[PDB]
Design a protein around this ligand. Structure first.
Ligand SMILES: *[C@@H]1O[C@H](CO)[C@@H](O[C@@H]2O[C@H](CO)[C@@H](O)[C@H](O)[C@H]2NC(C)=O)[C@H](O)[C@H]1NC(C)=O
Ligand code: NAG
Ligand code: NAG
Ligand code: NAG
Ligand code: NAG
Ligand code: NAG
Ligand code: NAG
Ligand code: NAG
Lengths: 346, 224, 366, 50, 198
């Protein structure tokens, strides 16, 4: 493998290099925030409306109470992550109806009232690129009861006791929070994050931004049209890159994919015997007498309990990683959007 | 007889059990004919016994129904019960008895320790007929399929799943077999099964349309 | 659920509701013949071990309570089933294997065993399901001069696979010099008589053995016993008993294309999804009747005792085990208002609830 | 041992998810080293004068 | 000689995979970062590398603190000698004391010790008659050896699950430390940081 292109910078005792021109570059950073909230019923999963299995499972103590407590804590933590990242603004700001901001085109990132869910063009592209795995936030038991074509995986997950809970904030609420943050950033600057929003023209705000990085503010006013054209061309390049290449959002796709795949594994573990004579509980309860079927049922209960504990532990570790990424995203929202950051490579 | 050698061309997959599955990939570990194997084409105009090695895949293209049946067994010169398949074009006789045949079996077309006897529907009804015979745990199992082909040059390309017909709990240490021909000539293919793992694809109609042999090449092992 | 006498404000996942079944259906084939166990269990004589008698039992009603009235045995030892449950569920075919052995070798009729009978005469498979019935027959298979009519093999060139029978007698050779049909030096006949005497010990007595091997249900079931069939009802959560397999659910007419040799249909979790009625050749889909989660939305116990109930993930025209329809289920006992407040108790997709003065009551808002 | 493998096949897919977890850790270690050290576009070189 | 521990781990199914980047590649990356930050300052981390003399770069870095640049130019031999003494003391501190890098030694030590535990659990009985699988297979018939092998399979599967869970938690901790080290490389080496005690 190659580390990079070889370069030898011409160092000398009395030679310096000073730039004479600039570019304005807009880059894209993708950060996961929350994941799918799930709930598991042990009696439907391990036993499946069997009374004898329930009476033998009652002797195993309080494993399922603490599994339910762990999954409820994860489900609360996901909504806390979304509220911590997005819901930081106090008031819902709006842009003026005249969209002139010194020559800068913000029509790609500001919402339009054409569609019901008031999202921007880039937000529509981002929502269309990530393919969801048909989570159970939508009602499907009426659809699962009416058998059409073949049995779905989500129907088997619902019938085996695995339920997906909807998030607290809908997509239009997160879009409205984001639009309020855009309106505050364009109109007021960094002043809305430290108290009341104080208006300033966008040329004067960008002159303040140039003065913050060590460039004198006469550079902006004598190169305003060039900087506006560079910003618009960079926004158009992000438009083209999002319309063409469909492998830049894949980290978020991972947040989908694992949260499907593990659940699929948790159904496949119902097809295992774990040393018993059958994986079907009714065949065990019908073929044998009380003692032998109790032994086989104990083997099945131990195996299914172990698989469910492994699922809960993996979910806890994934939730810790997702919370770390959400804390990073909240810090980046508070430091890059609500102000200007002097930290290099941040 | 005349022997030639032919590629199997991913052919000879049967249904592993009588359970309906749809829109799912199922992994099985049974006696399967391996993909791209070395089957033997027999032309009969003239017969040493063919070995029975953990199941036999038999393929024929005889339009005029010259081919008739098989003599699975060990001695095949009376003296036992053995196994016998005789078609009278309206019934199948799987009576485990003898007919006092010599080394050349034949059939002229113009009960001594009888243990088992069975009568059913006719067996042998662009006419490629495939059969699979296997012997597991004292049980003799037969799978069959009828397929139309375009040109009769070799075994065609494609997937035609084989369906079970007849299950028999007898046959007892079968190690050789001979195939009946009746003369008032033959173009039959013989292949040998092996214990293999397969990954079968069931479509929305419950039909096996594709399969992966998990020991052919490393790509198929990755797929399995 | 909280194990306390006072609760705090919030939403609590309390329990699960399931629609209970009402009726029971039993579906069995309409077969009227009776199985001939009488010509199996008691006869004039039983065959030898090397030529063990196999009888196929099919297409009859199998009563197993009359087996005890035919022979005076103790141990109805079964391996895959239980002797008290042989009448409820039912099978494809039964095979009865009859022979007579010595009392030391009754332990040799078992799966996964070696020895003399299980290695060279009569070998059971390792995955064998069925029952073995052995009873003493000293008063029928013994003579004072010796019973030499029952033969067993000493040794063979190779081991015996499960469920095979050897009949032909060949003179064994254990040397380079061939026997050539002569039982001279190093040439022994394989078959030897037992030689039963009444003066022998209690472990050397003759024992009649009948092995009943049931093969499991994969084909249409042919042989099983007296369970009265019930008429088939559909579109209701019932307890069904199809050919011996029991379950609870709703049976629906379908459009699945079973091939004519297929009987059942499985799932990813390997549970039964479709079934075939044994009387009328019809395909039915089994689906579990409606169930879900129940959560309780309450304020504090020091405030009030009023509650609201959220039934999670149901289009609640199927409520029982103010009505508001949310995307997280549906809400009973909370009045939706056309206002907007801060979120007190979070419910679901943008909907929250609170305990407000507008007579105190539980309200739900966006 | 063949009998141990035939009894281990009845325990499901614990081996597959254990192997997947270890593979994820092994990929993440290389991602950590790459994201710490590989931060420069070009391999710069110091001049011969020191 | 004798049977090594690593040979026993290899024979029991435990493998160590090599990393993607060799130590020479890490050294090349480190040398590139040093050459850039010596010859060009912080400009190589924000675009094209712009050359600047080192005394002038150090005067810029003094204006970043709060000290005017006339302090360095009138004292340049003193800062040079102090830096030379301070970097010469690092070699003398590293040539004697073996306790500074012990955190990195822990990253070795746990990754050995847990693996050693995964060998010792092959010597446990878990309630069976013996820990040797072939002794169980030869000493018993089919059903009893199936029972004992099921006991051993359950015990070894539990041990392997414990190892994988501990490795996952340690991987999360190492990833947090690697994120911190990447932030320190981005902000201390490629620039100048105003954050106190960072
Ligand atoms: C600084 O760079 C910009 C582009 O990065 C230059 O603007 C371009 O100038 C050429 C003339 O050479 C025009 O044809 C292009 O249309 C200009 N592009 C834009 C977006 O305006 C600019 O000329 C450079 N300035 C200096 C002093 O070199
Ligand atoms: C500074 O660099 C130049 C060019 O390399 C060299 O001629 C000069 O001697 C150097 N100054 C000192 C003090 O070494
Ligand atoms: C740029 O702004 C104009 C209005 O000033 C608008 O019509 C145009 O669509 C914008 N460009 C893009 C690419 O949206
Ligand atoms: C089958 O085996 C024969 C044996 O000689 C060989 O000649 C022939 O090439 C083989 N066919 C293959 C490998 O397809
Ligand atoms: C299933 O069979 C029907 C009946 O002909 C056919 O229309 C349909 O295309 C089939 N489904 C396939 C081939 O996937
Ligand atoms: C069982 O019922 C079916 C349908 O009613 C009928 O066709 C069949 O003849 C019956 N079987 C017997 C043995 O009467
Ligand atoms: C069994 O059948 C025989 C044959 O008639 C008979 O003699 C004998 O009494 C029967 N056994 C019993 C217990 O009735
Ligand atoms: C399911 O819920 C939707 C949403 O209100 C409703 O329109 C529809 O009628 C419901 N379906 C029923 C009650 O079958």
């Amino acid at each position: 493998m190659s580390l990079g292109a070889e370069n030898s910078v011409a160092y000398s005792n009395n030679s310096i290099a000073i730039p004479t021109n600039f570019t304005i570059s807009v880059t894209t950073e993708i950060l996961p925030v929350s994941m799918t909230k799930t709930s598991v019923d042990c009696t439907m999963y391990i036993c499946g409306d069997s009374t004898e299995c329930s009476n033998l499972l009652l002797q195993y103590g309080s494993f399922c109470t603490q599994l339910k407590r762990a999954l409820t804590g994860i489900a609360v933590e996901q909504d806390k992550n979304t509220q911590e990242v997005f819901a930081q603004v106090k008031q819902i700001y709006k842009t003026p109806p005249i969209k002139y901001f010194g020559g800068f085109n913000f029509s790609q990132i500001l919402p339009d009232p054409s569609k019901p869910s008031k999202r921007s063009f880039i937000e529509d592209l981002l929502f269309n690129k990530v393919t969801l795995a048909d989570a159970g936030f939508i009602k499907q038991y009426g659809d699962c009861l009416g058998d059409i074509a073949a049995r779905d995986l989500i129907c088997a997950q619902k019938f085996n006791g695995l339920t997906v809970l909807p998030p607290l904030l809908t997509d239009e609420m997160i879009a409205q929070y984001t639009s309020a943050l855009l309106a505050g950033t364009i109109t007021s600057g960094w002043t809305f994050g430290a108290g009341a929003a104080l208006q300033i023209p966008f040329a004067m705000q960008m002159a303040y931004r140039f003065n913050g990085i060590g460039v004198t503010q006469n550079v902006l006013y004598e190169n305003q049209k060039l900087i506006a054209n560079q910003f618009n061309s960079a926004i158009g390049k992000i438009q083209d890159s999002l319309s063409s290449t469909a492998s830049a959002l894949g980290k978020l796709q991972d947040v989908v994919n694992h949260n499907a795949q593990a659940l699929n594994t948790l159904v496949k573990q119902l097809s295992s015997k774990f040393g018993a004579i059958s994986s079907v509980l009714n065949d065990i309860l019908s073929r044998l007498d009380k003692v032998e079927a109790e032994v086989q049922i104990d083997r099945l209960i131990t195996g299914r309990l172990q698989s469910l504990q492994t699922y809960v532990t993996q979910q806890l570790i994934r939730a810790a990683e997702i919370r770390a990424s959400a804390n990073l995203a909240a810090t980046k929202m508070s430091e890059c959007v609500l102000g200007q950051s002097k930290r290099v490579d941040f | 007889r005349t022997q030639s050698y032919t590629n199997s061309f991913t052919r000879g997959v049967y249904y592993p059990d009588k359970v309906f599955r749809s829109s799912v990939l199922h992994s099985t570990q049974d006696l399967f004919l391996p993909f791209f194997s070395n089957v033997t084409w027999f032309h009969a105009i003239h017969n040493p016994a063919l070995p029975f090695n953990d199941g036999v895949y038999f393929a024929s293209t005889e339009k005029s129904n010259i081919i008739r049946g098989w003599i699975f067994g060990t001695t095949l010169d009376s003296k036992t019960q053995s196994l016998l398949i005789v078609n009278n074009a309206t019934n199948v006789v799987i009576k485990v008895c003898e007919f006092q045949f010599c080394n050349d079996p034949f059939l002229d077309v113009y009960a001594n320790n009888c243990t088992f006897e069975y009568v059913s529907q006719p067996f042998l009804m662009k006419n490629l007929r495939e059969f699979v015979f296997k012997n597991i745990d004292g049980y003799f199992k037969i799978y069959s399929k009828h397929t139309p082909i375009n040109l009769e040059r070799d075994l065609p390309q494609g997937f035609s799943a084989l369906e079970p017909l007849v299950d028999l709990p007898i046959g007892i240490n079968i190690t050789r077999f001979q195939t009946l021909l009746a003369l008032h000539a033959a173009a039959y293919y013989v292949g040998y099964l092996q214990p293999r793992t397969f990954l079968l694809k069931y479509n929305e109609n419950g039909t096996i349309t594709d399969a992966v042999d998990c020991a052919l090449d490393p790509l198929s092992e990755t797929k399995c | 659920t909280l194990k306390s006498f006072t609760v705090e404000k919030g939403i609590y996942q309390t329990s699960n509701f399931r629609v209970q079944p009402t009726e029971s259906i039993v579906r069995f084939p309409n077969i009227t013949n009776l199985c001939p166990f009488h010509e199996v269990f008691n006869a004039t004589t039983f065959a030898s071990v090397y030529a063990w008698n196999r009888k196929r039992i099919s297409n009859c009603v199998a009563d197993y309570s009359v087996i005890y009235n035919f022979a005076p045995f103790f141990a109805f030892k079964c391996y895959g089933v239980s002797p008290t449950k042989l009448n409820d569920l039912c099978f494809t075919n039964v095979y009865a294997d009859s022979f007579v052995i010595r009392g030391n070798e009754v332990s040799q009729i078992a799966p996964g065993q070696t020895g003399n009978i299980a290695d060279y005469n009569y070998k059971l498979p390792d995955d064998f399901t069925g029952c073995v019935i052995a009873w003493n027959s000293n008063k029928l298979d013994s003579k004072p001069s010796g019973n030499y009519n029952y033969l067993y093999r000493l040794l063979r060139k190779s081991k015996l696979k499960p469920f095979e029978r050897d009949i032909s007698t060949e003179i064994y050779q254990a040397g380079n010099k061939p026997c050539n049909g002569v039982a001279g030096p190093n040439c022994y006949s394989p078959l030897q008589s037992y030689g039963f005497r009444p003066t022998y010990g209690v472990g050397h007595q003759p024992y009649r053995v009948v092995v009943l091997s049931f093969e499991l249900l994969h084909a249409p079931a042919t042989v099983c016993g007296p369970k009265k069939s019930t008429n088939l009802v559909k579109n209701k959560c019932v307890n069904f008993n199809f050919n011996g397999l029991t379950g609870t659910g709703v049976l629906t007419e379908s459009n699945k294309k079973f091939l004519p040799f297929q009987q059942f249909g499985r799932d990813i979790a390997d549970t039964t999804d479709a079934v075939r009625d044994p009387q009328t050749l019809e395909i039915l889909d089994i689906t579990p009747c409606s169930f879900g989660g129940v959560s309780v939305i309450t304020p504090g116990t020091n405030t009030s005792n009023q509650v609201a109930v959220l039934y999670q993930g149901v289009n609640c025209t199927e409520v029982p085990v103010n009505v508001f329809q949310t995307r997280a289920g549906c809400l009973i006992g909370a009045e939706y208002v056309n206002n907007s407040y801060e979120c007190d108790i979070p419910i679901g997709a943008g909907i929250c609830a609170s305990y407000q003065t507008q007579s105190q009551s539980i309200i739900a808002y966006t």
